[PDB]
Design a protein around this ligand. Structure first.
Ligand SMILES: [Mg+2]
Lengths: 155, 54, 48, 51, 41, 213, 298, 181, 203, 145, 184
RNA sequence: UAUACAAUUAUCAUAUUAAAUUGUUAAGUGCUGAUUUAACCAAUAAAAAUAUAAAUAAUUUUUAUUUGUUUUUAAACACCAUUAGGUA
RNA sequence: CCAUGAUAAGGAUUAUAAAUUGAAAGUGUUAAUAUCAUAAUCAAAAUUUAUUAUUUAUAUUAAAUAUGUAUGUGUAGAUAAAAUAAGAAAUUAAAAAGGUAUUGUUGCCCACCAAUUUUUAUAAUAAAAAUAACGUGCAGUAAUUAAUAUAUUUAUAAAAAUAUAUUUUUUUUUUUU
């Protein structure tokens, strides 16, 4: 017969996290301190005031891949597919609008030209201009602004 | 076409010619079981049917 | 050292369980129940 | 690595201080642990430790 | 296969005692079994 | 816990944060070396190619018109999804729709029985090549089944980079030699070079260091 | 050694491990280095003099001033110049997939350029909706308009036969290979030449090279060289005699996936001095499900 | 005997080959591959490409395996399922290698971008071979000729593995000396 | 042995650096590290890891599951589009905690390790993706050279050496440094490690 | 490295080094050299040799780069692609017993839930054409008999 | 092995890998014994983890951070709400609860034959036909069912504020008002 | 000698709601003869290819009955013979 | 005779570098078992025994006495040595893969043969069970043409061969050429 070499030392894939779960440590340390003959550690003394979140069940017990257990590790983009397509089309038509906001690193405290372009596109859409014409008009407005800037630079 | 026992003997002899104990010692080797040098002895008293020596 | 690493403790305000708890560590079925006195085998009673 | 530890099996001391031992496949020192440097044998400020 | 079945854990003693609400001793105490013999002296 | 693609333990990614490039090149950012750099500017948010089969089961092909035309009367379309010897491709190689495979097998049986199709081989294998997709070597496909078609492009790019480096290093050597010659042998070479380095050596015009010449 | 094979020279340490690297090889001739360097300098100076006579070894600097280009600055400050610069900027701002200069891209664009050198009311959405067929035409991916009959005839790829070609069957087996030649009517021109027929079967290299390319090549070459006069005399007797050094039209038909195939085709190509091969076909009875074969050992 | 049987097409005094040959023959409807050999394309290379196709398609393997010996349906199903599972596992293994090679290609492209940044775009184009010295059309025509000749794609078929005739032929599709179950 | 001792003394504190790098990078959205609540959480967990009172896996779980703000995902929908926050604040906090706590005698060593173990890892495939089993201490682990944020991750040490036919007999005939010197009882014919049977000439 | 609990026997085949699936490079110059050396000519084609060597000089550096890339790939694979002989194999039919059990369950449910893992009886090569009237020609299900 | 010791919680017997999952909607709690849907272990589990687990459109157990089953509508009714609010993510136009998925063991069965690439018992009822024959034969000059108005039931429920009627009030994503107990 | 299985998953005979069954095709020299096999070998030797849509889940299977020996052209082919053939 | 132990010979992968090309796995003599034992060179001596490089055709026996044999085309089979102060140069090491044995293949184990005996039975019955040494074998134990299940068949015995169905058989890459 054939067996993997490390099959004997293979960790249990269903109960290897319950040992390291924070709540187990919290409860055990609470009981140990409440016995009255154990000096509480600093981590217990701090986390008794701020206990961890309750709803962070691991995927091992959840057995549901589409469950976002960890809010910190959650990765779900807020952009709808329509918004993604719109901004991708705008960036593909003009690389200036896409790169102008970001450049080497995302400056999160300044206005984004792509955001302004999307806002103007939405305004044109609700005014009555359809997709292609609205995109062309907003791009031409951005180019007019850039032309003003370049004219000032030349002067 | 050769028989199995002759093939085995020939292969063993050829491997011996072409080509451990201290690393691994089993209970038989330790207690002198497999060793053909060690042989039990008999009782010194002489029998009656055995042909006299010389 | 392993025992001190895996040491545990319980809440003694009750001095005994208030509900039957049934588990099994390595197939050995263990039942702990409330009782008037400490009634169990000598070794487990000494552990309790 | 030899590129760090150097191709030395003994402290770099003149062979006059080292004696080939008996029954042991190593060299020993008659003045145990008391290693005189090279300049001890040579005259003070000697070119290439020459006499 | 030749071995019998074994429970994963114990059966709750409270449930085991509660399921005995209609045992033969309880029936005798309620008086359901009609008497036709002499019984005890 | 494994990924469905190739049993990975982690999520495939190149850059997860919008500022890791700045963190890595903070010293260069402060010195101003990255005023007009390109590698950080374009590859900051680069992510791995989506290498997966969007239709692994096989219900994408053929086209609906090919479904309509996949009849016994036309062997041209039958030969499109049939091997050179006349056998059907395994689902591992060419995953046709179940409707496609049942239609193909029944049409092939009918055509063989009537006499419109040969029992072995296809008389339209050469003419069906245009309909058959072509994996051009010049144009790379991210989702190629084979790894050689990717390693060849990797080698091509590495050879281009090596060509850039070799060209610039040889240009530097040529310019340095020209400047030394223009300044003069005596004027250009330093005293140490003229005294010690000015001899034949394994680095300076050696004889053949190899036997069997 | 002790009844053992002698190890290869690689296992032995270096034969010249006890000599300095400068000895192997010696770099003698140091006295010539200065002489050759001075000779090189002298001849380089002479070549430089020749080049200077050919042209001019002069360089100069032009002291440009910034105030002079105010005319260019005023021209660029104009609205029209800014407009055309912004037009170029918008044209090049589109998505560009060209990272650096590519020889493939340059060759393709130049090839297309040289190939070029060698060579009312718009329909509405409602009209498109009411035209259901045009939607299918959009994604038809099928030939439209005139279509060549070469993609419709089912005998275009099939071979064209003539009454004169001789069909040469090359059968390759696990331990045998043989070639036979038939005419169009099916008459067997010459007797079959198998490995056993020619003696290659059952000799040296037994059970291994019986089906090899070597034996197949030998038997096929011998069969062709014996068949050629037989074919000539058969045609002469039939009354259609061979021409003056005519090429005999040969249709190769090969069967078997063993090793006795490459040798056969190589022999045919080596004898192609007279056997002009016109068509090549391979035949193989692919088993679907038939009678039980003899049982294997497994 | 089937046409693929071991004792098929045997040459003997009493054995007469079945079927008509020549022109419209027994194989006339059963020929799997027909190629019109043309000048400048050797028949040896034609046969080489055909054999490479039928070997890389794992078709001669099945033909020999089913033809030479009789194998039970259970054995054939076992072998085919094992082959499919091994192929799927190998595809899964190779997907990781493809992904890592794409990552290495990204690293190479980043190094190329670093070279572009440190040398200049025009300098990098010139090093890549931009026709910036093509004063006349002939200078660029020479490189066009070079790349035109390089584009010519010769057949990429390779030599097929030989067939090994082991004793008693435990496996008939065996092409390598490595032992198999 | 002296270099081994020096290496051990230098790398005795590498575990806290590994944990701090993992907390800085692996956590996709730790929030605002400048906030005193998150700063106190990180400081307490780092102190516990340094003291050894809590293992790294559980400390990381505590950090990633600690209470930060109600409707955390909804609030993050306003700021982060993809859920990935800037690492500058995280690195600054991870340096500040080690600066305040007297972890090492040299204050700059903590910052240098934190920066270097990140910049060296940034050029690897899946730089911030770690398998759960091998990310921290476990029954089955990786080689020290193949660890994620290890100080010896990148090396090209010599691993192939040519061997001659007499190597198994002359294993101890070179310039070997003997832990136990050969004696005549064991080795019948061996002069020693200091002798040279083919000496040269020196001035 | 052991993907899915099975060690990789060879990683050189993936690269293609020293294997059949190599990479074609400078094929034009290789063809020119082969033709020149095949033709009788007048002298050995040292010029073609120089051309081929100049073309393939960087092949050694390319091979070194691919070898170090393969080593880095092996390191990453050990890092996180595999399990180091932990998970059961998935490359043999008897490791997928559940799928074939499902197939047998489907067939059994189809055949009135009577025959499990049973196949129809073998029939002669020309059974549907040589058998006389009154004998079943087309094989039936193992339950139908 | 753990299976040899503990058999009440683990079954190593082949054909019983399905488990004892009670969280299915089938007539029995023994998934390996049920005969409605058969698990295709080789290809299933793409988005639902294991192969034995119920599909995303056939689940009766919901996590805290997982979306519930979308309502099938078959925005117009969100005028009173935020004008920029797009389509509600919990409203789908095409959502079938009992949507059969293609499974090789049940649909494409090849165990009777030699498992060759060319044969295998296949049923076409599982997946809608992609052939162009469909629309061409089912092409009519008259308009379709929505125009002809042959349906009198409409929505199964009488009046849905989200679908049938205009929607007022405020949205409630998490089930808070829908999962509550009256104190009056 | 009397004195507490399981019921959340147990591999040797406890099958019971399931769509089956039937298609009429293929292959036909004799010629100067070494095929197969580790080896021996026997006698015209080539051959049989068509599917899906459609049959309710139930309250009396308590109920018919059913699980690779199934009889003829070839190819396969177990007792026995030994110069070497018979036999599903 | 036997009368405990202990050194040898036997090159196959840690390499150039300021360096050695000889191993621990054991070779007659050596330190506990006894119970007729005088076996020992000091000369001039007796091949039948595996483990040893001898001088080849101009000049040939003087000091301890020192080799009379075999000329036969550098000649069958078989076989020995060297890559170190000598001169020799492109195809090579570098995968997987097993105990039913624990006395661990010199192993478990198998029937038959042989020997004792018990139980059901009284019918010239049949069946089953225990047992350290025999005889025939080598069937099984990755185990020498794989093993498992059912049916047939043969018979000194394990079993073997077939028909059909399985792998508690150790495994080798083809996503429309
Ligand atoms: Mg045996």
């Amino acid at each position: 017969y054939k067996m993997p070499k490390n099959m004997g030392v293979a960790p249990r894939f269903d109960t290897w996290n319950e040992k390291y779960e924070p709540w187990e440590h919290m409860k055990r340390m609470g009981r140990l301190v409440g016995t009255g003959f154990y000096i509480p550690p600093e981590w217990y003394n701090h986390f008794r005031m701020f206990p961890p979140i309750n709803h962070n069940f691991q995927q091992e017990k959840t057995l549901n891949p589409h469950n976002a257990s960890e809010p910190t590790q959650d990765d779900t983009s807020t952009l709808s597919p329509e918004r993604v397509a719109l901004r991708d089309e705008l960036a593909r038509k003009s690389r200036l609008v896409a790169s102008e906001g970001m450049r080497y690193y995302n400056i999160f405290w300044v206005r984004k030209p792509l955001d302004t372009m999307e806002k103007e596109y939405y305004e044109l859409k609700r005014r009555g201009v359809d997709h292609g014409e609205a995109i062309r008009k907003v791009l031409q407005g951005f180019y007019s602004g850039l032309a003003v800037k370049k004219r000032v630079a030349a002067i | 076409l050769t028989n199995r026992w002759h093939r085995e003997e020939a292969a063993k002899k050829m491997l011996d010619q072409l080509r451990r104990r201290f690393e691994y010692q089993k209970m038989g080797d330790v207690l002198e079981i497999n060793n053909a040098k060690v042989q039990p002895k008999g009782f010194p008293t002489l029998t009656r049917g055995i042909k006299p020596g010389c | 050292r392993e025992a001190f690493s895996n040491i545990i403790a319980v809440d003694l305000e009750q001095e005994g369980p208030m509900y039957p708890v049934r588990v099994n560590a390595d197939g050995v079925r263990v039942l702990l129940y409330p009782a008037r006195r400490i009634v169990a085998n000598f070794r487990v009673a000494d552990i309790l | 690595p030899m590129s760090i530890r150097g191709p030395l099996v003994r402290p770099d001391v003149p062979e006059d201080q080292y004696v080939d031992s008996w029954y042991i496949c190593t060299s020993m020192t008659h003045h145990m642990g008391d290693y005189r440097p090279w300049s001890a044998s040579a005259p003070p400020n000697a070119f290439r430790f020459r006499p | 296969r030749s071995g019998k079945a074994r429970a994963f854990v114990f059966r709750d003693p409270s449930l085991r005692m509660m399921r005995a609400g209609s045992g033969y001793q309880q029936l005798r105490r309620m008086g359901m079994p009609m008497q036709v013999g002499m019984g005890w002296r | 816990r494994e990924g469905w693609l190739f049993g990975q333990q982690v999520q495939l990614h190149y850059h997860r944060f919008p500022d890791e490039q700045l963190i890595t090149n903070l010293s260069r950012w402060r010195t101003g070396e990255t005023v007009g750099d390109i590698a950080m500017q374009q590859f900051r948010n680069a992510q791995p190619f989506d290498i997966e089969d969007k239709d692994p089961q096989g219900v994408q092909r053929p086209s609906p018109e090919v479904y309509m035309k996949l009849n016994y009367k036309n062997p041209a379309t039958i030969s499109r999804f049939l091997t050179r010897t006349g056998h059907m491709y395994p689902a591992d190689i060419l995953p046709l729709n179940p409707e496609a495979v049942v239609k193909l097998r029944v049409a092939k049986a009918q055509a063989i029985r009537i006499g419109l199709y040969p029992r072995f081989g296809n008389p339209f294998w050469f003419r069906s090549q245009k309909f058959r997709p072509k994996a051009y070597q010049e144009n790379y496909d991210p989702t190629t089944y084979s790894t050689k078609r990717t390693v060849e492009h990797f080698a091509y790019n590495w050879v281009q980079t090596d060509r850039i480096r070799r060209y610039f290093r040889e240009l530097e050597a040529v310019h340095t030699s020209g400047s030394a010659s223009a300044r003069g042998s005596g004027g250009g070479t330093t005293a140490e070079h003229k005294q010690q380095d000015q001899f034949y050596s394994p680095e300076n015009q050696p004889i053949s260091l190899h036997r069997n010449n | 050694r002790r009844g053992k094979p002698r190890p290869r020279a690689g296992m032995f340490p270096d034969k010249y491990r006890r000599v300095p690297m400068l000895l192997k090889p010696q770099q003698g001739g140091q006295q010539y280095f200065n002489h050759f360097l001075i000779r090189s300098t002298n001849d380089r100076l002479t070549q430089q003099d020749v080049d200077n006579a050919s042209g001019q070894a002069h360089s100069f600097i032009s002291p440009q001033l910034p105030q002079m280009d105010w005319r260019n600055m005023s021209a660029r400050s104009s609205e029209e110049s800014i407009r055309e610069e912004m037009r170029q900027l918008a044209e090049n701002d589109v998505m560009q997939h060209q990272r650096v200069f590519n020889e493939r891209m340059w060759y393709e664009k130049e090839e297309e350029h040289r190939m070029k050198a060698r060579s009312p009311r718009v329909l509405g959405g409602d009209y498109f909706k009411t035209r259901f067929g045009y939607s299918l035409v959009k994604n038809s991916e099928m030939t439209q308009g005139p279509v060549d009959y070469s993609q419709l005839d089912m005998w275009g790829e099939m071979p064209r036969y003539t009454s004169d070609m001789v069909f040469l069957y090359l059968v390759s087996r696990r331990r045998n290979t043989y070639a036979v030649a038939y005419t169009y009517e099916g008459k067997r021109i010459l007797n079959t030449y198998t490995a056993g027929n020619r003696g290659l079967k059952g000799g040296d290299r037994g059970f291994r090279s019986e089906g090899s390319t070597d034996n197949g090549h030998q038997v096929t070459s011998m069969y062709l060289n014996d068949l050629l006069p037989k074919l000539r005399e058969m045609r002469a007797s039939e009354g259609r005699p061979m021409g003056r050094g005519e090429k005999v039209e040969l249709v190769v038909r090969v069967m078997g996936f063993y090793n006795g195939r490459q040798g056969a085709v190589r022999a045919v190509q080596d004898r192609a001095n007279e056997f002009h091969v016109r068509y090549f076909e391979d035949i193989t009875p692919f088993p679907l499900n038939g009678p039980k074969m003899p049982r294997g050992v497994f | 005997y089937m046409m693929y049987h071991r004792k098929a097409m045997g040459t003997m005094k009493y054995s007469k080959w079945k079927g008509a040959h020549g022109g419209i023959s027994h194989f006339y409807g059963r020929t799997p591959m027909v190629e019109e050999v043309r000048p400048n394309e050797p028949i040896t290379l034609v046969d080489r490409r055909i054999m490479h196709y039928v070997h890389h398609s794992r078709l001669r393997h099945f033909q020999l395996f089913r033809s030479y010996q009789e194998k039970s349906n259970s054995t054939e199903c076992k072998l085919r399922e094992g082959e499919m599972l091994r192929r799927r596992w190998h595809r899964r293994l190779q997907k990781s290698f493809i992904a890592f090679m794409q990552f290495k290609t990204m690293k190479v492209l980043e190094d190329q971008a670093r070279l572009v940044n440190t040398y200049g775009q025009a300098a990098v184009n010139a090093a890549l071979g931009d026709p910036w010295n093509a004063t006349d059309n002939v200078a660029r025509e020479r490189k066009s000729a070079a790349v035109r000749r390089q584009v010519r794609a010769l057949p990429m078929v390779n030599v097929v593995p030989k067939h090994v005739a082991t004793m008693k032929q435990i496996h008939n599709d065996r092409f390598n000396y490595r032992w198999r179950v | 042995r002296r270099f081994k001792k020096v290496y051990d003394v230098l790398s005795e504190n590498d575990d806290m650096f590994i944990w701090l790098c993992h907390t800085a990078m692996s956590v996709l959205n730790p929030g605002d590290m400048r906030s005193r609540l998150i700063y106190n959480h990180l400081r307490i967990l780092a102190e516990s890891v340094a003291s050894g009172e809590m293992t790294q896996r559980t400390a990381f779980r505590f950090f990633e599951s600690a209470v930060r703000s109600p409707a955390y995902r909804e609030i993050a929908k306003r700021q982060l589009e993809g859920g990935a926050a800037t690492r500058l604040a995280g690195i600054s906090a991870a340096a500040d905690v080690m600066r305040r706590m007297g972890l090492t005698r040299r204050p700059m060593s903590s910052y240098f390790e934190l920066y270097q173990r990140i910049v060296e890892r940034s050029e690897a495939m899946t730089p911030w993706g770690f398998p759960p089993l091998f990310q921290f201490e476990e029954r089955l682990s990786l080689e020290p050279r193949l660890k994620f944020f290890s100080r010896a991750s990148q090396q090209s040490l010599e691993r192939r050496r040519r061997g001659h036919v007499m190597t198994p007999h002359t294993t101890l005939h070179g310039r070997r440094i003997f832990w136990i010197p050969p004696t005549w009882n064991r080795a019948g014919r061996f002069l020693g490690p200091h002798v040279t049977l083919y000496p040269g000439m020196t001035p | 490295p052991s993907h899915s609990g099975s060690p990789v026997f060879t990683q050189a085949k993936l690269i293609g080094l020293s294997g059949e699936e190599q990479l074609t490079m400078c094929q034009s110059e290789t063809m020119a050299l082969r033709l020149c050396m095949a033709k009788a000519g007048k002298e050995t084609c040292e010029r073609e040799s120089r051309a081929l060597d100049s073309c393939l000089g960087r092949v050694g550096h390319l091979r070194r780069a691919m070898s170090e890339a393969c080593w880095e790939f092996n390191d990453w694979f050990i890092q996180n692609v595999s399990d180091n002989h932990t998970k059961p194999f998935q490359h043999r039919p008897h490791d997928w017993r559940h799928f074939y059990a499902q197939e047998k369950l489907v067939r059994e449910r189809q055949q009135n839930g009577h025959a499990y893992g049973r196949r129809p009886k073998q029939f002669s090569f020309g059974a549907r054409y040589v058998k006389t009237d009154g004998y079943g020609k087309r094989p039936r299900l193992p339950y139908n008999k | 092995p753990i299976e040899f010791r503990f058999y009440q919680r683990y079954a190593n017997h082949p054909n019983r890998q399905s488990g004892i999952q009670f969280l299915t909607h089938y007539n029995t709690h023994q998934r390996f014994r049920v005969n409605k849907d058969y698990i295709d272990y080789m290809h299933w589990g793409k988005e639902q983890g294991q192969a034995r687990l119920p599909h995303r459109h056939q689940r009766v157990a919901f996590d805290f951070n997982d979306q519930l089953h979308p309502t099938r509508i078959g925005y117009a009714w969100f005028a009173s709400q935020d004008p920029t609010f797009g389509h509600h993510p919990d409203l789908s136009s095409s959502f079938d609860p009992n949507y059969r998925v293609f499974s090789h063991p049940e649909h494409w069965n090849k165990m009777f034959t030699k498992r060759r690439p060319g044969e295998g018992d296949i049923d076409l009822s599982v997946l809608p036909s992609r052939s162009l024959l469909g629309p061409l034969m089912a092409h009519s000059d008259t308009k379709g069912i929505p125009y002809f108005k042959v349906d009198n039931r409409g929505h199964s429920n009488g009046r849905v504020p989200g679908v049938n009627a205009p929607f007022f009030g405020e949205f409630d994503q998490k089930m808070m008002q829908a999962m509550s107990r009256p104190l009056n």
